Amino acid sequence: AHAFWSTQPVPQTEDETEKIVFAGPMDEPKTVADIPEEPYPIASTFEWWTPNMEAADDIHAIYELLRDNYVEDDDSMFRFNYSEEFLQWALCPPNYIPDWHVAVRRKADKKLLAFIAGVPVTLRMGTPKYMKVKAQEKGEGEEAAKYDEPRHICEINFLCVHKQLREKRLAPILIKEATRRVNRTNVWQAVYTAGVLLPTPYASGQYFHRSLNPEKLVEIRFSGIPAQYQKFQNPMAMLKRNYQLPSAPKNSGLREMKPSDVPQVRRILMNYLDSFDVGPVFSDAEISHYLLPRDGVVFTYVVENDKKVTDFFSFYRIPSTVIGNSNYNLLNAAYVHYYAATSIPLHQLILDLLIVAHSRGFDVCNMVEILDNRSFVEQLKFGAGDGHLRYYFYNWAYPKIKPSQVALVML
């Protein structure tokens, strides 16, 4: 049983969601006025804190909590080390709601003990195309289309409870208070992802990694020298040769994205993302925020032909603490972010992403099999990793879809 999640408006079993055919709310309709105006009660030794995610010292406080207590791999070899600059970027997009950043601290010393963050997103999340088809066959098209319009919902991430406070049921409380604050803004859905299985994902995809620094990856035991490299003479030279990349990008026309590229990037991105069942909608302000280059944070390159932007890719940086190891403290990872190709095959565009990342000092490039990420796996030498990333809605009935029908990247 799930003492918490059984109380929530989410489907409860894989069996419930296999039956779902239309997109729509799960819960009773409610109004801002129904929602308690005061924070959810917590123990008197604690207090709720809304950090100011533009005060360097509050960012630093969140930074430390996540550095020491946020997501690790299943073998506790790595832990994400999101940077302060990354956290400010991810938590403060245009029109963000400071109240959706929710922390608990110890009343005494103000030691930060838990956090969860919501940000706004405009998401297309109506009935998927294949259900809309069945709907038509059956005369149920208006039902199928009722929730087609993009919705302003909340994106939740960075849920974290201090290692000392684990399994004390604090995470349900964080989630309830976040839910209250968001509802008080008259928002009734959320989208979130996790590596863990909860009730109940609408989509799940494997991770993929592309070695850029295989000697470092083997040394930290992220990668192995596969047993076929055994009956070879000097494995590490072969491994390095297998993953070697050009020193410079191959697409003439490639350069970093510029603020004046914003309208064209927006158009080619929206045209592309619009083909997926679930995906965000971005204004020019959101394209500038999420895609303009920002040092050590996000890296975005466009292909410009005939003074026109016809393709682009982006990746973002999240270092991980290497937990065991002598020689290394940090793993430097690039994650494929949004992209669009109109003039070249997708593998030729993403090869330049790998070349750039490698040339800028990244050890590995990671992604999940959403978008059309599967279309370049084999040719660019990506391998399936261990985790699955599961996608979830809160308060939204949604049929099970494949991850290749998902166009929302989660930071």
Ligand X SMILES: O=C1CS[C@H](c2ccc3[nH]ncc3c2)N1Cc1ccccc1
Which positions are catalytic?
411
| Residue 165, marked binder | yes
Alpha helices in 29-114 (DSSP H): 56-69, 84-91
| Residue 158, marked binder | no
Please identify which residue in 225, 294, 385, 400 interacts with ligand X, judged by CB under 6 A. Answer: 385
Question: Taking CB under 6 A as the rule, does residue 394 contact ligand MYA?
Answer: yes
Shorter beta-carbon distance to ligand X: residue 36 or 361: 361
Select from 123-131, 181-189, 284-292, 330-338 the region that touches ligand MYA (CB under 6 A).
181-189
Q: Which does 169 bind (CB under 5 to 8 A by kind): ligand MYA, ligand X, none?
A: ligand MYA
Shorter beta-carbon distance to ligand MYA: residue 134 or 168: 168
**Segment 220-239, which members bind ligand X (CB under 6 A)?**
222
Amino acid letter for position 214: P
Please identify which residue in 387, 400, 402, 404 interacts with ligand X, judged by CB under 6 A. Answer: 387
Please identify which residue in 9, 40, 46, 79 interacts with ligand X, judged by CB under 6 A. Answer: 79
216-220 own/partner pairs: CB under 8 Å, 24+ apart: 216/328, 216/331, 216/363, 217/363, 217/364, 219/325, 219/327, 219/328, 220/77, 220/322, 220/325, 220/328, 220/331
Find out whether 157 and 90 touch, Cβ atoms under 8 Å.
Answer: yes
Find out whether 372 and 279 touch, Cβ atoms under 8 Å.
Answer: no
72-108 burial code (b ≥16 CB/10 A, e <16): ebeeebbbbbbbbbbbbbbbbbeebeeebbbbbbeee
Q: Give the integer Cα–Cα distance in Å for 411 and 333.
A: 13
State the DSSP string of 38-56: SPPP--TTEEEE---TTSH
Find out whether 249 and 373 touch, Cβ atoms under 8 Å.
Answer: no
| Residue window 345-384: x/- pattern of binding to ligand X, with contact defined by CB under 6 A | -------------------x-x------------------
Total of residues contacting ligand X (CB under 6 A): 17
| Residue 65, marked binder | no
Shorter beta-carbon distance to ligand X: residue 22 or 207: 207
Shorter beta-carbon distance to ligand X: residue 176 or 360: 360
**Segment 259-318, which members bind ligand X (CB under 6 A)?**
none
Shortest Cβ distance from residue 165 to ligand MYA (Å)?
Answer: 6
Shortest Cβ distance from residue 260 to ligand X (Å)?
Answer: 34
Element of type H or E holding 383: strand 383-394
Shortest Cβ distance from residue 376 to ligand X (Å)?
Answer: 18
Question: Taking CB under 6 A as the rule, does residue 71 contact ligand MYA?
Answer: yes
For the purposes of burial, counting CB atoms within 10 Å of the CB of 38, is it exposed (0-12), middle (13-18) or buried (19 or more)?
Answer: exposed
Find out whether 171 and 161 touch, Cβ atoms under 8 Å.
Answer: yes
Q: Which does 386 bind (CB under 5 to 8 A by kind): ligand X, ligand MYA, none?
A: ligand X
Q: Give the integer Cα–Cα distance in Å for 300 and 130.
A: 33
Question: How far apart, in Å, are the Cα atoms of 311 and each of 19, 268, 347?
Answer: 39, 8, 12
Question: Taking CB under 6 A as the rule, does residue 219 contact ligand X?
Answer: no
Question: Taking CB under 6 A as the rule, does residue 158 contact ligand MYA?
Answer: yes
Beta strands in 289-346 (DSSP E): 298-305, 308-322, 330-341
Sign of CA dihedral 399, 402, 405, 410: positive
Q: Residue 305's Cα: distance from chain center in Å?
A: 31
| Residue 90, marked binder | no
Q: Residue 129's Cα: distance from chain center in Å?
A: 23
Please identify which residue in 103, 154, 302, 350 interacts with ligand MYA, judged by CB under 6 A. Answer: 154
Q: Which does 157 bind (CB under 5 to 8 A by kind): ligand X, ligand MYA, none?
A: ligand MYA
Token representation of residue 366: 């990671």
Question: How far apart, in Å, are the Cα atoms of 107 and each of 25, 81, 112, 287?
Answer: 37, 26, 9, 39
Q: Which does 161 bind (CB under 5 to 8 A by kind): ligand X, ligand MYA, none?
A: ligand MYA
Residue list, annotated binding site for Mg(2+): 165
Residue list, annotated binding site: 2-5, 159, 161, 165-167, 169-171, 193
What residue ranges bind ligand X (CB under 6 A)?
71-73, 78-80, 207, 209, 222, 320, 331, 333, 364, 366, 385-387
Residue list, annotated binding site for CoA: 2, 4-5, 161, 167, 169, 171, 193
What residue ranges bind ligand MYA (CB under 6 A)?
2-5, 69-71, 154, 156-161, 166-172, 175, 178-179, 182, 187-190, 192, 194, 196, 198, 394-395
